[PDB]
Structure formats: structure tokens, C-alpha cells
Design a protein around this motif. Structure first.
Motif, short mmCIF file in Angstrom:
data_model
loop_
_atom_site.label_atom_id
_atom_site.label_comp_id
_atom_site.label_asym_id
_atom_site.label_seq_id
_atom_site.Cartn_x
_atom_site.Cartn_y
_atom_site.Cartn_z
N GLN G 33 0.83 -1.20 0.00
CA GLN G 33 0.00 0.00 0.00
C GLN G 33 0.86 1.25 0.00
O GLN G 33 0.49 2.27 -0.58
N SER G 34 2.03 1.19 0.64
CA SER G 34 2.89 2.36 0.69
C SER G 34 3.46 2.69 -0.68
O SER G 34 3.47 3.85 -1.09
N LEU G 35 3.94 1.68 -1.40
CA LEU G 35 4.39 1.92 -2.77
C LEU G 35 3.28 2.52 -3.60
O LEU G 35 3.49 3.51 -4.31
N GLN G 36 2.09 1.93 -3.52
CA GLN G 36 0.95 2.44 -4.28
C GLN G 36 0.77 3.92 -4.04
O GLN G 36 0.51 4.68 -4.98
N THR G 37 0.90 4.35 -2.79
CA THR G 37 0.78 5.77 -2.50
C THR G 37 1.91 6.55 -3.15
O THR G 37 1.69 7.59 -3.78
N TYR G 38 3.14 6.04 -3.04
CA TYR G 38 4.28 6.80 -3.55
C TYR G 38 4.23 6.93 -5.06
O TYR G 38 4.43 8.02 -5.61
N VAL G 39 3.98 5.82 -5.76
CA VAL G 39 3.96 5.88 -7.22
C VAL G 39 2.84 6.80 -7.69
O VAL G 39 3.01 7.57 -8.63
N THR G 40 1.69 6.74 -7.03
CA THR G 40 0.60 7.63 -7.39
C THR G 40 1.02 9.08 -7.21
O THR G 40 0.69 9.94 -8.03
N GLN G 41 1.75 9.37 -6.14
CA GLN G 41 2.28 10.72 -5.97
C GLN G 41 3.19 11.10 -7.12
O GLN G 41 3.09 12.21 -7.66
N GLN G 42 4.08 10.19 -7.52
CA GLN G 42 4.99 10.49 -8.62
C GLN G 42 4.23 10.81 -9.89
O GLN G 42 4.47 11.86 -10.51
N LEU G 43 3.30 9.94 -10.29
CA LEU G 43 2.57 10.15 -11.52
C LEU G 43 1.96 11.54 -11.57
O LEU G 43 2.18 12.29 -12.53
#
Ligand SMILES: *[C@@H]1O[C@H](CO[C@@H]2O[C@@H](C)[C@@H](O)[C@@H](O)[C@@H]2O)[C@@H](O[C@@H]2O[C@H](CO)[C@@H](O[C@@H]3O[C@H](CO)[C@@H](O)[C@H](O)[C@@H]3O)[C@H](O)[C@H]2NC(C)=O)[C@H](O)[C@H]1NC(C)=O
Ligand SMILES: *[C@@H]1O[C@H](CO)[C@@H](O[C@@H]2O[C@H](CO)[C@@H](O)[C@H](O)[C@H]2NC(C)=O)[C@H](O)[C@H]1NC(C)=O
Ligand SMILES: *[C@@H]1O[C@H](CO)[C@@H](O[C@@H]2O[C@H](CO)[C@@H](O)[C@H](O)[C@H]2NC(C)=O)[C@H](O)[C@H]1NC(C)=O
Ligand SMILES: *[C@@H]1O[C@H](CO)[C@@H](O)[C@H](O)[C@H]1NC(C)=O
Ligand SMILES: *[C@@H]1O[C@H](CO)[C@@H](O)[C@H](O)[C@H]1NC(C)=O
Ligand SMILES: *[C@@H]1O[C@H](CO)[C@@H](O)[C@H](O)[C@H]1NC(C)=O
Ligand SMILES: *[C@@H]1O[C@H](CO)[C@@H](O)[C@H](O)[C@H]1NC(C)=O
Lengths: 118, 197, 48, 273, 106, 117, 48, 49
Positions: G33-43
Motif C-alpha cells: 500500500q505504501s508503494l501504491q501511495t508513492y507511485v501515485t504521488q509520482q505520476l
């Protein structure tokens, strides 16, 4: 009433083996922890061994650990002690005793039998 | 002697039909272009480390049997096809030091010009055998080409296997390795291509 | 997703509601998390 | 649900709605009939020959009896009060009579009362790690009941000991300090405690449906309907769809196909090949 | 069930003789068989259990052998009180079944 | 020592009932499985019934299934076999038998009582 | 994330797989879930 | 000196002994078959050693 009869006593040559038997009457032998105690001539009594009623545990004195084997058969209401590698210092009168509760009770001591190792 | 197991050893990973889809799966496979030990039979107990690819090229069906086990003599599996009727027994038979064929158990079953392929892996007490037969016209070694092996039997022997011996035309031995493959099912549900990952 | 099977009908055939509801929940939070990712992917891609 | 207009009001949460085109719900054809398909196997299943065995295998060489070609009635097993426990792992014990299985193995043996807990996935112990080990993903039901007057007398039940290092699941090692034969007998007697009584254990190891199944429950088959929405049940593969004749060539060992979505795409009628 | 066949049915011998009684099992009783003797007016009286093990008070001339399906009762030397019928008995699986019997005659 | 005493035998009309009683002495009856066995006059003996000491299970020979019931009461150290729907072929001498272990031992067989139907 | 420890190797050294897989699943759930948050932030930030 | 001690405290006044500076072989306890239950919570009884 409550009587305990020891049997099998005699004379032993050093190093050989013997089997003792103690008979129970007048109490629920199948539900009592059972003990052996010996007392050498004119000397102090020595605690030897104890077996709980189910035989799941067997505890022995240090002087006889690895050489003595206690056993019981509640069907026959009897106590059995096996002696192997008997030494001269094992000469004593052996008593089978028990407790209506937890401590050796005076009604629960046998007449004893004499074991001589020589 | 040694030969190139070009692309063979690929077998249907499970018992579920699929079609026209590239399915990725991992299991004990025979890696592509691997060393496979060649034995010949003119003019031998082997290890079974984790599951043994087997193959043989025949002219007169002289190869007939396998012995799987640890000691392989009166202490085991036995597979024999005596010219009309397959027999599988897992009795602890009496076997000679050099077992051959003339011209306490759990299971018991009953029933160069040709190439016969097999896979024998024993996981969790289940001895799994796959196979595939095809005609051939070649005298040297394993023909280069692709076909997929398919389950025919499942033996929950529980019998522990470490070494095996061939009974009796060349036959060949690889070893399986837990590698992931990508399998290409055709339109008809047949494996036609594969990629060793 | 940690569930005993990925075929929803299979669980209901195999398990009584007291236990299957746990397994079903596992699939739900997973697949729902999957739509969440996919819908999110669409929105950013839509703006692009 | 009164009318399409009343649906729009409920979605929009308003008694009046602006003009436009509004998605509201999902139209679904409902299934009309119910179809149950199962094979001719109506021969009864010899669970009595297992659970009423006069002699049970010792734990180190446990008796693995195969069950196939029968109609297994698990309600007889489940309901019987003679069982001290009935613990299933991969399935719910009341659902057994609805499923159909590829094969069934009845592994039967007698173990001491204190160790009945050891016959379970992901367990260890003297019995569980030297005599009979179950895999972690074990699928099946474990059954046990007192045998204190069928087994106790007795010293004919053996279990292994000091020298070994392996138990890998469902392995049966029957091989026979100074020296010790790696087996000692239980002292099963009628006068001992519950933890020391012998327990007859039967473990039904199920292999999940992956092939044309052969042990089905006591279900009644019906006729088959094509080209219409039906609720269909083939050997326990349930679902809803329209059954049409296919042009697919299944292999003789493949019971059913799949799509890329792991949904069932094609099935083989167990009665009409 | 389990069927068991005794052979011979009747057999005549004199005192001191060697006799053998053969018991035939329809399947494995692996070594769980019993031998019994009955004289008329007498109950079935035990000889052997698991087919090779001597009961208390049973003369050593009585013995048995066999495992699986083929089993044997043994008389080394006939005594005059051994003139009776003999039943091999299985107990591998209930119901407990009995052979047809073998009565030894003079 | 060890003795099993059967009682209750006699003459019964066909289709009627009879109850046998069996007294035990000299052994722990409360933990021993019990057996009934019958022998027809000068015929081969037939196993009849068995009950373990706690009686959770109860097995019968086929010919008496549904008509015979075996019962025990360790309090009285007695074994019972109730017969119903008696037939002529059930005429036999009925014995009690048990085991220190698992097998009828000759020390554990009764004298028998005759039942005539 | 509810696990008994945030050191993955500590769990593996301490628990058998039948119990470890519960704990490990919790750590994966959050970290995934943490990666999902981070990658979404990047996009989104990448779009900016 | 703990498990097979001839005598245990009553539960309301439960005793406790401290353990330190030793080589703890948990196998001898675990594989000992006298135990009716052996449930570990933060660890598993085969990772103790
Ligand atoms: C194992 O064996 C027991 C004992 O029954 C015997 O074995 C069976 C295989 C059949 O051959 C029986 O004829 C035989 O006596 C079975 O336990 C019980 O069996 C009975 C059948 O006799 C089952 O039916 C019951 O019958 C009574 C009679 O009045 C009814 O009151 C009950 O309502 C019921 O119909 C009974 O369900 C069964 N189980 C019990 C009593 O707990 C057993 O079924 C058999 N197989 C297994 C797997 O245990
Ligand atoms: C299967 O294994 C058993 C293991 O017990 C073998 O039984 C033993 O047989 C030998 C003689 O072959 C006897 O000396 C032993 O006493 C037997 N074991 C016991 C526990 O009594 C059996 O022979 C094997 N079957 C074979 C070799 O066909
Ligand atoms: C299968 O058999 C092999 C022997 O061929 C077993 O491997 C041996 O296992 C013992 C167990 O104590 C070890 O002492 C040996 O060192 C092992 N041999 C080797 C070469 O490593 C193996 O454990 C068996 N497997 C099963 C599941 O029974
Ligand atoms: C197999 O490896 C050996 C060396 O161990 C080598 O000589 C041989 O060429 C290899 N096999 C093939 C087919 O290349
Ligand atoms: C093969 O062997 C089996 C038994 O070993 C026998 O029944 C069968 O007839 C044999 N086949 C031929 C063709 O002889
Ligand atoms: C499938 O089988 C048919 C014969 O029934 C054949 O014509 C067709 O070519 C096969 N499909 C493929 C992809 O080879
Ligand atoms: C099963 O029986 C039905 C008739 O009840 C028959 O139509 C069908 O062919 C049978 N299945 C077979 C033979 O596989």
C-alpha cells in the motif's frame, strides 16, 4: 484393614539381581502413589523410590539411580521393585509404604523383608 | 557421452484446458539446451536428485523397465512392459546386481523408429509420470523439435526415491530444475512453443 | 490475495457462511484495491 | 423500483431531475431452470470398510486406502456422535456432500490421546515429525474417537524414535549410543488416563477438483438445457450461463477449460462425453 | 466375510503319531489365528493364539505355525487325551469365524 | 479363580423371547470386553455378540441382527443377552467368553446354558 | 502494520510458515500500500 | 529446577524463577512427550534453539 506384605527377600551375591514384591489390601491401591523405603541394620532409614498410581513418573534415590526399577500393576494390587548390580551396602530391610493423602502414614507401612548382599 | 536436450522436457503443468493464451508457470522442468547423459546399448544406477527427465529411441522395444528407490534390491518400484501388457508393481523385489530381462508394497497396476518420452518427479509422496509417443526416423540422438508431455498416471506411493536404474537402443537422462517457463497453447489447446525464463 | 481460491463460486460451494465470509472478504479488499488502482490510472491518463 | 422514472429519482436523490441520460442500474436476464449433472457412480462408498475396520494400522506404517468410484455420503460421518472430534481444514464439513472430488485417500492409524492435536497441518512433535507429517496446505477432514475398549488390553502399536532426520509430508518410512530399534510401543491399557488412551484417527485427504472427478456426493442429476440461461452445476463447478455445443477438442484427461480470467469457459458433461 | 477351511475333516491315528492340521484362510489374517479343542460335553478349550504362541498349561506337543493365509497345527507325539476335534479360528476381522473342524480318531 | 456362570436357559416357543444372564467373578469385569457364543447340538459353534466394557459399541453376527440385544452392568458384574423373535434354528448352548486381552481364552469361557426353541 | 516486528528476517527466524504467513501478509499489505501511495504521488507530480 | 520441581506455587501467589547465563536447549523440553500442550505465541517451538 490396610495391610502391605513384602516378599522376595533373601541373600544376594554382589553384582547379581533380585526382584521384590509388595502386596496391597484394604485400600484403593489403583489410586495411590506408592513408595519403597529401606533401612539397613541399626542405621537410618533411606528413601528409595516412588511411583505414582499411573506410572507416568518414577523417581529414584541417587544411590540406586540406574540400578533400581520400581513397577506396579494395579490389577494385581501389588508393588514390584527390581534390583540389579546389587552391592553390599544395599543390604537392608525394604519397606513398601504409601499415603492416604501425601505423606507416609503409619497405617500404610508393611512389615518389610530382609535383603542381604554378600 | 553427452547430447543437447534442445527444447524437450516441457509437460502440461496442470490438468486444466486452456487455448490461444500464453501461460506462465513454474515447476521442475528440464532446462533448455542442457547436458543430458547418453547411454547406449551395444557390445547403470543413476541419481534421481529432484526429478528425472527420461527419453529413449527404439527399434524393437528392448527398453522395458525402471527401478526407482534408494537401494533397489529387496528393500522400491518396478515398471515392466512384457510385450503386450504393462505391469507396475512396487513390491520390494529380488533384483540381480545387473538386472535384465530375457527374450511389502502399496500399489499394483496392470494393463530407431519410435521415440518415447517420460518425466518422473516424486513430490509429497506422489510419484507423477508424464509421457508422449511419436514416430521417428533417426539413428543418432534426440531429434531436435518440440512436443509436450502429458500426465497419464499418479502414484501416491510415499516411497522415497533417490536413485534409479534402466532395465532392458539408446536412452537419455536429464535432470529437472525449478525454472519458470512461458508456455504457448495453440488454438487447439496443444503446447507448441516454450521459453525458458 | 491469500484466499483459499480465486473462484468466488468455489468458496461458497465449499464453505459455510461463518468461514467463507472471511475468505470472501479477502478477495473483496483485493479486487476492490485493484479497481482503485485501475480507476486512478485512468484519471491521470485521462488528464494527459 | 416502480418505474424507470422512479429509479432516476432514487439515484439522483431528488423528487425532480434535470433532463439528460442517467445510468441507474444493471439489467440481468434471470435464469429460468436449474440443472444438476453427476455421473452414474451410484455404487455406494465403503466408508464402513474404513471406519469400522476391526484392525487399524500402526502409526509408523499407516494404512492408506484409496477411495474412488463411489457415492460418498458424508452426512453419515458428520452427524454420527461416535466421533470425539471432526476437524476439517480446506472445506466446511457440511458442504462435503455437494462437492465432487478427483480422488479420496483414507489414511487410518491409531495414536496416543495426548498427540491427537499433532495430526494437523503445520504441526510438529514426535508423532508429527517422525511418523506421519501432513503438508501445510492440507485439504481434508481429520476424525478421531476413543478406542479405549477396542485397542487397550496392549503393546502392538509402534511409533518411531531417536535416530532420524526427515519426515517430508506423507512419507512412510518403515525401516527397522550403542543401538536401538527405532520404534517403541504404546502402553495402551484400559486403566490409564484420557491423555494415555489410544485414539483411532482417520484422515480424509481430498485432492481438489482439477480432473474428471470420480467421487461425487449423493446428488440427483437432471436433464440438460442448451441455448438458455440456466443455473448449472457440473460435478460441483457451479455458475450461471448459456450452454451451447462447442467445437473445442478436450484432451481425455481434461475435465474443464478456463479463460484468461480463471472463469470457467467450457465443461465436459460427465454423463454425455 | 472371512472364510476358513480345515483339512482334513476327519483323520484317524494311534498314540504317539505325528499329525498335522491345515487351516485355509480366504485372505490375510496375517498371523492372527487361534486353535481350539473340544471334546463332547466340553467347552471350546484354547490351544494357541496368533497361531504360534503357547498358552499356559498347554503341553509343548501342541504348537502351531503359519502366517498370512496358510496355517498349521502340530502334534509331535499323540497322547491318549488328544482324541478330539480341533478348530482353527480367525479374529482379524469381525465376525469371528470358525473352521468346519477336524476330529482326530483312534 | 475366574468363572463365568450362565443362567436363564430353557424352552421357548417359536417367535417368543428369552433373556440370558451371565455372572462374572475373578477378574476386572468392568474393563473387559464380553462375548456370547453358541454351539448347536453336535454342530459347529457360532459367534453371537460382543460388547466392550463401556458398551458404546455393540456388534452382532448376521443371523441374529435386529432380534438379539446384548447388555451389561459392571455394577453387578453381569452380562445379559436378550433374544426376541426366536426361531427353531436358534436352539443352541450359549456361552459367555472374554479375554484378558483380545482373544477368547479358555480360562474365560462359561459352562453354557441350553436354549431350546 | 500490526505485525509483531518490522524486520522481515526477524519473523522468518522466529515463526513457522503456517504462522509466519499471517504476519508476513500484514507487512506486505502495508508496504505494498505504501508503494501504491508513492507511485501515485509520482505520476501526479510527473504530470505537473 | 523449574519444570520437574517437586513443588509449584499456588496460582494466586504464582512463583517465578529468573533464567540467565545458560545454554537453553528447548528441544529437550519440546520433544519430551509428557506435555499435554505446548503453545508458543511470539515464536515457534522449532525456532527457539
Ligand atoms: C460402522 O458400524 C456401525 C455399527 O453398525 C453396524 O455396521 C454397519 C456398517 C451396518 O452393517 C449395521 O447394520 C451394523 O449394525 C454403524 O453405526 C450405526 O449403524 C446404524 C445401522 O445399523 C445406523 O443407522 C441407525 O440405526 C438405528 C437403529 O435403530 C436408528 O435408531 C438410527 O436412527 C440410525 O438409523 C447408525 O446411523 C450408525 N451410527 C450411529 C448409531 O452412531 C456405522 O454407520 C458404520 N459406519 C460408520 C462410517 O461408522
Ligand atoms: C516387510 O517388513 C517387515 C518388517 O517387520 C518384515 O517383517 C520381518 O520379517 C523378518 C523375516 O523376513 C522377521 O525376522 C521379523 O521379525 C519381521 N518383523 C517383525 C516386526 O516381526 C517382512 O518380512 C517384510 N516383508 C517382506 C520382506 O516381504
Ligand atoms: C530418502 O533416502 C535418502 C537416502 O538415499 C535419505 O537421505 C539420507 O537421510 C538420512 C536421514 O538421517 C541422512 O542421515 C543421510 O545423510 C541422507 N543421505 C544423504 C545422501 O543426504 C532421505 O532423507 C530420504 N528421504 C525421505 C523423505 O525419506
Ligand atoms: C557436458 O559437460 C561436459 C563436461 O562435464 C562436456 O564435456 C560436454 O560437452 C557437455 N555436454 C554437451 C552436450 O555439451
Ligand atoms: C505379461 O506378464 C503378465 C504377468 O507377469 C501376464 O499376465 C501377461 O500375460 C504377460 N503378457 C504377455 C504378452 O505374455
Ligand atoms: C486443430 O485441429 C484441426 C483438425 O481437427 C486442424 O485442422 C487445425 O490446424 C488445428 N489447429 C492448429 C492451430 O494446428
Ligand atoms: C450413464 O447412464 C445413463 C443412463 O442412466 C446413460 O445414458 C449414460 O450413457 C451413462 N454414462 C456412461 C455410459 O458413461
Amino acid at each position: 484393614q490396610v495391610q502391605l506384605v513384602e516378599s522376595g527377600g533373601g541373600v544376594v551375591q554382589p553384582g547379581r539381581s533380585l526382584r521384590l514384591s509388595c502386596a496391597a489390601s484394604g485400600f484403593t491401591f489403583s489410586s495411590y502413589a506408592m513408595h519403597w523405603v529401606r533401612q539397613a541394620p541399626g542405621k537410618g532409614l533411606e528413601w528409595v523410590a516412588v511411583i505414582p498410581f499411573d506410572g507416568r513418573n518414577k523417581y529414584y534415590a541417587d544411590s540406586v539411580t540406574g540400578r533400581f526399577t520400581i513397577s506396579r500393576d494395579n490389577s494385581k494390587n501389588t508393588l514390584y521393585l527390581q534390583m540389579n548390580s546389587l552391592r553390599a551396602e544395599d543390604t537392608a530391610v525394604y519397606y513398601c509404604a504409601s499415603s492416604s493423602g501425601y505423606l507416609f502414614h503409619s497405617d500404610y507401612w508393611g512389615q518389610g523383608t530382609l535383603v542381604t548382599v554378600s | 557421452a553427452y547430447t543437447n536436450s534442445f527444447t524437450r522436457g516441457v509437460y502440461y503443468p496442470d490438468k486444466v484446458f486452456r487455448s490461444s493464451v500464453l501461460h506462465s508457470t513454474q515447476d521442475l522442468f528440464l532446462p533448455f539446451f542442457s547436458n543430458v547423459t547418453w547411454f547406449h546399448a551395444i557390445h547403470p544406477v543413476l541419481p534421481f536428485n529432484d526429478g528425472v527427465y527420461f527419453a529413449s529411441t527404439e527399434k524393437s522395444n528392448i527398453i522395458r523397465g525402471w527401478i526407482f528407490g534408494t537401494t533397489l534390491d529387496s528393500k522400491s518400484l518396478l515398471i515392466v512392459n512384457n510385450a503386450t501388457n504393462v505391469v507396475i508393481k512396487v513390491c520390494e523385489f529380488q533384483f540381480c546386481n545387473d538386472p535384465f530381462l530375457g527374450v511389502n508394497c502399496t500399489f499394483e497396476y496392470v494393463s530407431f523408429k519410435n521415440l518415447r518420452e517420460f518425466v518422473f518427479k516424486n513430490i509429497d509422496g506422489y510419484f507423477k509420470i508424464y509421457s508422449k509417443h511419436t514416430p521417428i526416423n533417426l539413428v543418432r540422438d534426440l531429434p531436435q523439435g518440440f512436443s509436450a508431455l502429458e500426465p497419464l498416471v499418479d502414484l501416491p506411493i510415499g516411497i522415497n526415491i533417490t536413485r534409479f536404474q534402466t532395465l532392458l537402443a539408446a536412452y537419455y537422462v536429464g535432470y529437472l530444475q525449478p525454472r519458470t517457463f512461458l508456455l504457448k497453447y495453440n488454438e487447439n489447446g496443444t503446447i507448441t512453443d516454450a521459453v525458458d525464463c | 490475495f491469500g484466499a483459499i481460491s480465486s473462484v468466488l463460486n468455489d468458496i461458497l460451494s465449499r464453505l459455510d457462511p461463518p468461514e467463507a465470509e472471511v475468505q470472501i472478504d479477502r478477495l473483496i479488499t483485493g479486487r476492490l484495491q485493484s479497481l482503485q488502482t485501475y480507476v486512478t490510472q485512468q484519471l491521470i491518463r485521462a488528464a494527459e | 423500483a416502480l418505474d424507470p422514472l422512479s429509479e432516476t429519482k432514487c439515484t439522483l436523490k431528488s423528487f425532480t431531475v434535470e433532463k439528460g441520460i442517467y445510468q441507474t442500474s444493471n439489467f440481468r436476464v434471470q435464469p429460468t431452470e436449474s440443472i444438476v449433472r453427476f455421473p452414474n457412480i451410484t455404487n455406494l462408498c465403503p466408508f464402513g470398510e474404513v471406519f469400522n475396520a476391526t484392525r487399524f494400522a500402526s502409526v509408523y506404517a499407516w494404512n492408506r486406502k484409496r477411495i474412488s468410484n463411489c457415492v460418498a455420503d458424508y452426512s453419515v460421518l458428520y452427524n454420527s456422535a461416535s466421533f470425539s472430534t471432526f476437524k476439517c481444514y480446506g472445506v466446511s464439513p457440511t458442504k462435503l456432500n455437494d462437492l465432487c472430488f478427483t480422488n479420496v485417500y483414507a489414511d487410518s492409524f491409531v495414536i496416543r490421546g495426548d498427540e491427537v492435536r499433532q495430526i494437523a497441518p503445520g504441526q510438529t512433535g514426535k508423532i508429527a515429525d517422525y511418523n506421519y507429517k501432513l503438508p501445510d496446505d492440507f485439504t481434508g477432514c481429520v476424525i478421531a474417537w476413543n478406542s479405549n475398549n477396542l485397542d487397550s488390553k496392549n503393546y502392538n502399536y509402534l511409533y518411531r524414535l531417536f535416530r532420524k532426520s526427515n519426515l517430508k509430508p506423507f512419507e512412510r518410512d518403515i525401516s527397522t549410543f550403542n543401538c536401538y530399534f527405532p520404534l517403541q510401543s504404546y502402553g495402551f491399557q484400559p486403566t490409564n488416563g484420557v491423555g494415555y488412551q489410544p485414539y483411532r484417527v482417520v484422515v480424509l485427504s481430498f485432492e481438489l477438483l482439477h480432473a474428471p472427478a470420480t467421487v461425487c456426493g449423493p446428488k440427483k442429476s437432471t436433464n440438460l438445457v442448451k441455448n438458455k440461461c440456466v443455473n448449472f452445476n457440473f460435478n460441483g463447478l457451479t455458475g450461471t450461463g448459456v450452454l451451447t455445443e462447442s467445437n473445442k477438442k478436450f484432451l481425455p484427461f481434461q475435465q474443464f477449460g478456463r479463460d484468461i480470467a480463471d472463469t470457467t469457459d467450457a465443461v465436459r458433461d460427465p454423463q454425455t462425453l | 466375510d472371512i472364510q476358513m477351511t480345515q483339512s482334513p475333516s476327519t483323520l484317524s491315528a494311534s498314540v504317539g503319531d505325528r499329525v498335522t492340521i491345515t487351516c485355509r484362510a480366504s485372505q490375510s489374517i496375517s498371523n492372527w489365528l487361534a486353535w481350539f479343542q473340544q471334546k463332547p460335553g466340553k467347552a471350546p478349550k484354547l490351544l494357541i493364539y496368533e497361531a504360534s504362541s503357547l498358552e499356559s498349561g498347554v503341553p509343548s506337543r501342541f504348537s502351531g505355525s503359519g502366517s498370512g493365509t496358510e496355517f498349521t497345527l502340530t502334534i509331535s507325539s499323540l497322547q491318549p487325551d488328544d482324541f478330539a476335534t480341533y478348530y482353527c479360528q480367525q479374529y482379524n476381522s469381525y465376525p469371528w469365524t470358525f473352521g468346519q473342524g477336524t476330529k482326530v480318531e483312534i
